[PDB]
Design a protein around this ligand. Structure first.
Ligand SMILES: N[C@H](CCCP(=O)(O)O)C(=O)O
Lengths: 273, 272
């Protein structure tokens, strides 16, 4: 009844601070001595944010206690040569019973972990400067960029699931856009705002959050109806976990009764439209 | 085996048309050249022709998981809510009742995933994300769910949803909707088509329903418009009994289909 749970910092879903008090919960982080050793120190941190508030509600509703820790090998979860790292890895290799955070439900992961119902919608979205007109990832402007002059300047953050999806579904688009690879989201926002980039293709929940709080409300996302590969963030559990049904029912109860919306208002909804 | 599939009439997810005289389904293509795959579905019973988003999905699921099927329309015409008997007993009506009683093995329809139903059945991961909105006739002007004509109701302005649907449940269960619910329960309709026709004939002034359906209706019938905004987000899922041997692979198939652009194709063919 007391559970090992893993998370990962990604504001505003999981925000990590030094030590707890207030709306925070304790979370430990194994911090390495250097990059040539496995030796390290457990450090006390405090965690808060959208997914942490969900966890607090689940612990209460589903009646469990937990020890929360931050993942240290990789991020959300990537399968390299059939070996998982990140939060998915922690669950797969039974170091955690549950993973909580901005964790995208997909087929590859669902083969090795169980997911709860989605608690936040996401997928592949597009962000542009206000005034630019595109429909979504499947727009011909993206699929056949040289059909236009000048061609659209657009990129994503490489090496993750967004790139992988585009590579699989739109091979020419993938080939074209690598020249506009962005190091991270923050770099991409600046590129858009300074006219160095026309569109940034990325995770919908993240782009919605960034657009919601952009300074001057100059950045815009497509409508949710044009999100490609719609899915959600979900809680990952061990395959055949006894906790899945009650976690599923609780999340559906939270959504149905307005609790999820007030969490969204609290953490995700920005001043812009 | 051979799975019994229950569905319901609900364009653009399920269209229902007469067979040709020889009992087959007429061959038809979309405006952009896509074949329209049709299956025989029995219903209120007479063999008929069914096609649309949910039918294309069923055919994909069938091929992927190698099952066969026979499709029928829900006998009572309802989605499914749980109601008291006579008794201390409760009973599900609609597609929910048919799944639970064994008259169907799978529900393939725009069935909203909610806590009430998930207590009793298993839902796949969502095959479609959408929400609730409001449909009115052009010339009717409301701000949406918080308009005073909704939050402060009278019989001068009539609004409603479909009986024995998830939307009915959504309004019954929340204390802060208690005033709205009391108005609606005097006016709810037997089906979405009837409520939509009623809005066109100025007999219903606002219809609260699934945005995937309402936005489609508004895009075909220029005398109808929606609020625009969703006031609640929800998903449609495939429904199975909790002992179903198919449930894991149905969900994986749905996730696979979102990721490989199959659902994108269905959205463009049927929903956009
Ligand atoms: N939510 C993250 C995915 C974010 C998008 P990516 O950086 O993989 O293109 C995850 O669960 O892996």
């Amino acid at each position: 009844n007391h559970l090992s749970i893993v998370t990962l910092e990604e504001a505003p879903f999981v925000i990590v601070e030094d030590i707890c008090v207030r709306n925070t919960v304790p979370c430990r982080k194994f911090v390495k001595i250097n990059n040539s050793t496995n030796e390290g120190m457990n450090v006390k941190k405090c965690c808060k944010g959208f997914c942490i508030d969900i966890l607090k509600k689940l612990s209460r509703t589903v009646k469990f206690t937990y020890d929360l820790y931050l993942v240290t090998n990789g991020k959300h979860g990537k399968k390299v040569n059939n070996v998982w790292n990140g939060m998915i890895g922690e669950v797969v290799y039974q170091r955690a019973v549950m993973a909580v955070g901005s964790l995208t439900i997909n087929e590859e992961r669902s083969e090795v972990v169980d997911f709860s119902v989605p608690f936040v919608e996401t997928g592949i979205s597009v962000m542009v400067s206000r005034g630019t007109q595109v429909t979504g990832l499947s727009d011909k402007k993206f699929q056949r960029p040289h059909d236009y002059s000048p061609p659209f300047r657009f990129g994503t953050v490489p090496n993750g699931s967004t790139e992988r999806n585009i590579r699989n579904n739109y091979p020419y688009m993938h080939q074209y856009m690598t020249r506009f690879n962005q190091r991270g989201v923050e770099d991409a926002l600046v590129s858009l705002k300074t006219g160095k980039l026309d569109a940034f293709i990325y995770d919908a929940a993240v782009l919605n959050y960034k657009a919601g709080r952009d300074e001057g409300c100059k950045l815009v996302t497509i409508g949710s109806g044009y999100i490609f590969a719609t899915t959600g963030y979900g809680i990952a559990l061990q395959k055949g976990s006894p906790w899945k049904r009650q976690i599923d029912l609780a999340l559906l109860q939270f959504v149905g009764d307005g609790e999820m919306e007030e969490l969204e208002t609290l953490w995700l909804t920005g001043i812009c439209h | 085996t051979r799975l019994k599939i229950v569905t319901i009439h609900q364009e653009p997810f399920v269209y229902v048309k007469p067979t040709m005289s020889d009992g087959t389904c007429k061959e038809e293509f979309t405006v952009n050249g896509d074949p329209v795959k049709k299956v025989i579905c029995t219903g209120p019973t007479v063999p008929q022709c069914c096609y649309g988003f949910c039918i294309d999905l069923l055919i994909k699921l069938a091929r992927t998981m190698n099952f066969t099927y026979e499709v029928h329309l829900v006998a009572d015409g309802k989605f499914g809510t749980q109601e008291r008997v006579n008794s201390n007993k409760k009973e599900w009506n609609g597609m929910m009742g048919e799944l639970l009683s064994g008259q169907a093995d799978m529900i393939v329809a725009p069935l909203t995933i909610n806590n009430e139903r998930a207590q009793y059945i298993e839902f796949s991961k969502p095959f479609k994300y959408q929400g609730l909105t409001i449909l009115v006739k052009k010339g009717t002007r409301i701000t949406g769910i918080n308009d005073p004509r909704l939050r402060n109701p009278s019989d001068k302005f009539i609004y409603a949803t479909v009986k024995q649907s998830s939307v009915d449940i959504y309004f019954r269960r929340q204390v802060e909707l208690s005033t709205m619910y009391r108005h609606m329960e005097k006016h709810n309709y037997e089906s979405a088509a009837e409520a939509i026709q009623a809005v066109r004939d100025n007999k219903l002034h606002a219809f609260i329903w699934d945005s995937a359906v309402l936005e489609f209706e508004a895009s075909q019938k220029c005398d109808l418009v929606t609020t625009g905004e969703l006031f609640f987000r929800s998903g449609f899922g495939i429904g199975m009994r909790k002992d179903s041997p198919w449930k894991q692979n149905v969900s994986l198939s749905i996730l696979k289909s979102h990721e490989n652009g199959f659902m994108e194709d269905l959205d463009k063919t049927w929903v956009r």
